């Protein structure tokens, strides 16, 4: 590669040396893509190597098999596993594709051409070339739209996707008539992120999922064609910084928001993250506790509408701050929960009293019992329960692992966005090295600060 | 010395042998620092690996037992021993190292030798600052960790019933000691402790903000994007812009430093004052002089059920800590509290 | 020529010549922070009792309601609300709004906005001054911690009642309940945070005492040592080489900081990265990841359980558990 | 030395040190008043 005297960047910033080296930059990117595909294949095969047919996938520390099963591979009615060969095929295809991408990354990193400008003008670029920057953005936008449409095709004609909201415990269903209504699609986007609305995390049906994917795929392809055939406007040119590190900073802020959103999706959403495969959410486990303690005490011959707590509020049933009937206890804070095991018992007034007394189902009762016994509560040792509990159960929820890891990654990537936004602005300005010591700006400003 | 003859002696030969440039400066203080510090550190590493706590506390605190780093400790001896010095030749052990280890003498060893190692290190700071002809502000700064160490590991157990109530040297044992001070002493509410907290958090603020301000107001000296190669050892100009730093913090925060000497003296002053205040508060707690209660708020809460505050919640939590930790932490009291009388809320 | 109203306002906002820099981040910061300051002071003085736990047990929290400086606190939002976004115009009356913990939510949202724009404004002043830009990156550590105790822990726990009360005794209560549920002391990220602030005090006293140890003589014993330093002077006021040789022959000659640049970089990076890690410690315990669980870790050959220091922590943790929210619980396991 | 005192010294307190003294004393009041009233 190079040394510090020919680049000015030390080894702890050695990748910065290849900011202007387009070929080595491309090789580092595709070698990284090989790493991502390699981890996906390696972890997927490791997970199917550590898979037990009896226990569900949330008890065994699985985070990729629930994704594949949500897509509708190897699962049937209720979420039991029919075969693991789709998971094995996914893992193997990922490993071999990672081998190919790693060959390419090693090739451009070691013996690939230094710069792609003098010989392959389609691929070589300078960072201040706004036309070709938008061209590459359009290529990648077309690729993203094609991926979104691949999910749409999978949901429409390639076996369907897993629905937890279908009757009988949920199953793999073929999506028919997705919600292409623009108001329904963008009301999620314009929605508030807070309780009761949850921004886009509160998408709660596969019709909305696949309709939103139709919209994102079509808009992404349209934006790709638009970016390939246009050049940025002067107001955008004035508004932006047009260096490679600036483009990196923009990407970092974007994927940081994406990581925080994925944290909230894993922690709250149960239709894109079906509770059979990922375990119960926090609200789900609390409502499950209150639900099964309702039905146990009903079967022990007690009244549920009566028997207020020590506070005079209602041990089993109270009213939410808007009026409809919700489960008693501190689980009132999770009154916003909506699951497939509460909806057949929930009507216009919230929890229906006669339906809750009479129309219990065995699968709902077992699901509530298990969503009590496997709550997203655990330690770093993977010891289940609260921090005061025994070392007897080996369980930490995949929801807990995903939410924690992706909040950490989202936070550092926001901080990396700060670092790169500041350094890109300072490098465009001439400040990346320090103050000039003879043209210091503060010395040209009046005193009194 | 001083235009006199002063014929040389064994003192002068030893002094010239000690005060010379080596890989490690030994000095006169190293006659104390090196053995006492080595014995304190090695005794801690020995106790965390082999020496048991089954007889002093009825716990497990060694790697040979199965404890890891976070959980192993060199345990304080039994309350029955009080403030005994636990000499290996003393009455409790009677010369016998093996049953000396299990009676808790290793805590007294580590505490006394650690105190003398700390004295040796501050004497080393004094000596090295004298030999290089620099002001002893490093030793003045180190006065605060020794103040904390003596008030916590010496004055507090001497004030209480015995060494048993000192902190055992180990991570989970320190956490026990901390939750003990919460439950029994309400050490959160103590004004001296919260002065220590303000001092330590302010010192961390000063450290971080001086580092960031210096690292972001540099002068160029460039022709290279690595700023770390723009520094030479021996020159006579400022490396970062003091005036730019003062302007920046004057317009961000409203007030800013403009004297480098006062800035660094403040960076010295904040943690020392914080740790000294914490030391004084722990000395108060050595005699059970707690800031446990607010008399007016307690009498108001006794004469009104409707009065509920976070302070009263803390008082209830402290009762819970004491009553749920006393039986297993204090075996000497033989506190067999039945499950009946323990404080407990609804459910849980 | 610059006569238009927007451009004149732009040059007023972006001006470095102000006593306090405003900038485009300050035009979001200043109203939000002033709103939060106003509501916080008014609530701290005269806020009626707040039903924090949702169990009709209102906590007073304010000075005029019989609290002192240590005990007064702006009480968190009701547990009945959860995370349901309670502003004034949602409430029927100001009385209802004050009962359900509305001032806490107002202060928290405005304060999160204010600190985010404070970090942005630090960057923007560093930009208009020709500075290097990463002081905002250093300030991202306390901002992350404030967001972790005011936003992320309530979001992961479902309720703004779980947020840190805006008080002193409320902060202590937040810690006791937090350790009860999560065992923060046995978390590596919190251990890193404690190491970060202990090393922050360590290195603050270290660097201050090394600079004060190597001060250069300009003044006399009449004048304070700071009087030897003149503002804006070009010469360095202390002997870096003397301090470096002191530290090297004090601990290790090679393992000192020969670059003052790298030394100040270390001073910046250590507590910032440790406060980052412990802020993520809170953030990961929001989604119930908790500290280490070493209870009944050691057993003997015959299966009996030996108590351990972690088990003493567990005993204190149980005491912190059962007493916290004594009436709010109706069911054994505290999943909510 | 002479009839007047040779060690005649002037004391100085800049406005910054006045500000530290006032913050210090008032912060001691804010901190300790709750405990003195108890």
């Amino acid at each position: 590669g190079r040394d510090q005297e020919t680049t000015g960047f030390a080894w702890w910033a050695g990748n910065a040396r290849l900011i202007n080296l387009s070929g080595k930059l491309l090789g580092a990117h595709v070698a990284h893509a090989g790493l991502i595909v390699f981890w996906a294949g390696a972890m997927n095969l490791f997970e199917v190597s550590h898979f037990v047919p009896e226990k569900p996938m949330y008890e065994q520390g699985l985070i990729l098999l629930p994704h594949i099963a949500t897509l509708g591979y190897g699962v049937g009615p209720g979420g039991e596993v029919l075969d693991t060969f789709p998971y094995f095929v996914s893992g193997v295809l990922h490993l071999i594709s990672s081998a190919v991408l790693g060959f390419g990354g090693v090739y451009h990193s070691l013996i690939g051409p230094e710069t792609l400008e003098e010989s392959y003008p389609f691929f070589g670029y300078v960072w201040k070339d706004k036309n070709k920057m938008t061209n590459i953005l359009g290529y990648h936008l077309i690729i993203l739209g094609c991926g979104a449409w691949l999910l749409v095709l999978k949901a429409l004609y390639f076996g369907g996707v897993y629905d937890t909201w279908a009757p009988g415990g949920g199953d793999v269903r073929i999506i028919s008539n997705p919600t292409t209504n623009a108001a329904i699609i963008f009301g999620y986007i314009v929605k508030s992120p807070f309780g009761g609305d949850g921004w886009i995390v509160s998408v709660d049906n596969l019709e909305d999922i696949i309709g939103g994917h139709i919209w994102i795929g079509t808009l992404c392809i349209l934006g790709g064609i638009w970016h390939i055939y246009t050049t940025p406007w002067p107001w955008a040119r004035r508004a932006f910084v047009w260096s490679g590190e600036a483009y990196l900073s923009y990407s970092l802020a974007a994927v940081s928001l994406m990581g925080f959103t994925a944290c909230c999706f894993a922690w709250f959403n149960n239709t894109a993250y079906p509770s059979e495969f990922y375990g119960p959410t926090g609200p789900e486990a609390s409502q499950a506790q209150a639900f099964t303690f309702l039905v146990r005490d009903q079967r022990l011959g007690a009244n549920v509408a009566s028997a207020q707590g020590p506070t005079g509020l209602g041990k089993y049933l109270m009213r939410s701050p808007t009026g409809e009937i919700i489960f008693g206890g501190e689980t009132m804070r999770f009154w916003d929960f909506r699951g497939p095991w509460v909806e057949p018992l929930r009507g216009p007034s919230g929890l229906d009293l006669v339906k809750l007394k009479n129309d219990i189902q065995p699968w709902q009762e077992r699901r509530a019992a298990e969503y009590m016994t496997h709550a997203p509560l655990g330690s770093l040792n993977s010891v289940g329960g609260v921090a005061t509990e025994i070392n007897a159960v080996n369980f930490v929820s995949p929801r807990s692992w995903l939410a924690t890891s992706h909040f950490c990654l989202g936070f550092f990537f926001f901080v990396g966005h700060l670092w790169h936004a500041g350094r890109a602005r300072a490098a465009a300005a001439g400040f990346e090295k320090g103050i000039d010591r003879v043209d210091e700006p503060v010395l040209s400003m009046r005193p009194l600060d | 010395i001083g235009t006199y003859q002063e014929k040389r002696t064994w003192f002068d030969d030893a002094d010239d042998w000690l005060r010379q440039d080596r890989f490690v400066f030994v000095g006169w203080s190293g006659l104390l620092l090196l053995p006492c510090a080595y014995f304190a550190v090695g005794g801690w590493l020995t106790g965390c690996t082999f020496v048991t706590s089954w007889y002093t506390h009825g716990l497990a605190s060694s790697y040979i037992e199965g404890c890891n780093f976070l959980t192993a400790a060199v345990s304080t001896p039994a309350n029955s021993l009080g403030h005994s010095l636990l000499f290996v030749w003393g009455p409790e052990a009677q010369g016998d190292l093996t049953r000396w280890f299990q009676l808790g003498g290793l805590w007294a060893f580590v505490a006394l030798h650690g105190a003398f190692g700390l004295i040796g290190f501050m004497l080393r700071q004094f000596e090295i600052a004298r030999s290089v002809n620099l002001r002893p502000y490093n030793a003045i700064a180190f006065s605060a960790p020794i103040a904390v160490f003596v008030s916590v590991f010496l004055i507090y157990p001497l004030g209480q019933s015995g060494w048993f109530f000192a902190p055992s040297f180990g991570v989970a044992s320190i956490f026990r000691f901390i939750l003990f001070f919460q439950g029994f002493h309400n050490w959160t509410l103590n004004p001296f402790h919260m002065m220590g907290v303000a001092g330590v958090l302010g010192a961390a603020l000063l450290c971080a903000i001086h580092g960031a301000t210096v690292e972001n107001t540099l002068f160029e000296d460039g022709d290279g994007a690595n700023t770390f190669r723009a520094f030479n050892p021996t020159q006579a100009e400022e490396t970062y812009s003091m005036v730019t730093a003062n302007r920046f913090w004057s317009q961000i925060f409203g007030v800013a430093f403009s004297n480098k000497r006062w800035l660094h003296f403040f960076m010295l002053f904040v943690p020392v004052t914080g740790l000294w205040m914490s030391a004084l508060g722990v000395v108060g707690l050595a005699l059970n002089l707690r800031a446990y209660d607010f008399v007016s708020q307690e009498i108001r809460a006794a004469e009104d059920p409707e009065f509920e505050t976070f302070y009263t919640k803390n008082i209830l939590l402290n009762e819970g800590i004491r009553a749920w930790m006393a039986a297993q932490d204090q075996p000497h009291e033989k506190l067999t509290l039945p499950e009946e009388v323990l404080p407990r809320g609804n459910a849980l | 020529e610059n006569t238009s109203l927007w451009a004149r306002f732009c040059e007023w906002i972006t001006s470095t010549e102000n006593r306090l820099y405003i900038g485009w981040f300050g035009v979001i910061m200043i109203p939000t922070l002033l709103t939060a300051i106003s509501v916080y002071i008014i609530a701290f003085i005269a806020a009626p009792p707040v039903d924090i736990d949702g169990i009709r047990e209102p906590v007073s929290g304010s000075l005029l309601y019989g609290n002192n400086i240590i005990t007064g606190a702006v009480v968190p939002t009701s547990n009945a609300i959860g995370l349901h976004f309670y502003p004034i115009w949602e409430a029927a009356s100001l009385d209802e709004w004050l009962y359900n913990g509305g001032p806490y939510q107002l202060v928290v949202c405005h304060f999160f906005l204010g600190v985010c724009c404070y970090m942005g404004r630090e960057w923007e002043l560093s930009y208009r001054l020709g500075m290097r830009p990463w002081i905002a990156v250093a300030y991202s550590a306390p901002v992350a911690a404030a967001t972790a105790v005011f936003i992320i822990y309530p979001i992961g726990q479902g309720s703004f009642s779980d947020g840190m009360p805006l008080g002193i005794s409320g902060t202590f209560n937040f810690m006791i309940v937090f350790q009860a549920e999560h065992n923060i002391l046995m978390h590596p990220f919190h251990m890193f945070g404690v190491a970060g602030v202990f090393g922050g005090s360590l290195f603050s006293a270290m660097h201050g005492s090394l600079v004060t140890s190597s001060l250069i003589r300009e003044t006399t014993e009449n004048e304070s040592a700071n009087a030897g330093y003149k503002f804006g002077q070009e010469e360095e006021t202390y002997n870096i080489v003397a301090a470096h040789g002191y530290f090297g022959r004090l601990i290790f000659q090679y393992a000192s900081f020969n670059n003052s640049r790298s030394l100040h970089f270390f001073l910046a990076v250590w507590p910032v990265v440790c406060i980052w890690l412990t802020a993520l410690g809170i953030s990961t315990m929001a989604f119930n990841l908790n500290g280490f669980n070493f209870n009944q870790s050691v057993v003997d050959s015959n299966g009996r359980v030996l108590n351990t220091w972690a088990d003493i922590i567990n005993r204190a943790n149980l005491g912190m558990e059962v007493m916290h929210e004594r009436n709010a619980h109706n069911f054994p396991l505290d999943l909510a | 030395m002479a009839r007047p005192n040779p060690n005649k010294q002037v004391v100085e307190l800049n406005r910054s040190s006045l500000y530290w003294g006032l913050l210090l004393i008032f912060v001691l009041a804010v901190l300790f008043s709750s405990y003195i009233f108890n």
Binding site: L448 | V243, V255, S296 | G232 | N14, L23, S34
Partner: peptide
């Protein structure tokens, strides 16, 4: 009677803060 004292002490600290921000000794470049 105590809330009077606490309020006075708090606004006194805030007043000293205000005076320290906007009424400091102006630093000089020389």
């Amino acid at each position: 009677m105590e809330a009077l004292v606490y309020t006075f002490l708090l606004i006194g600290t805030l007043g000293i803060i205000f005076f320290s921000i906007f009424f400091r000794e102006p630093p000089r470049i020389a």
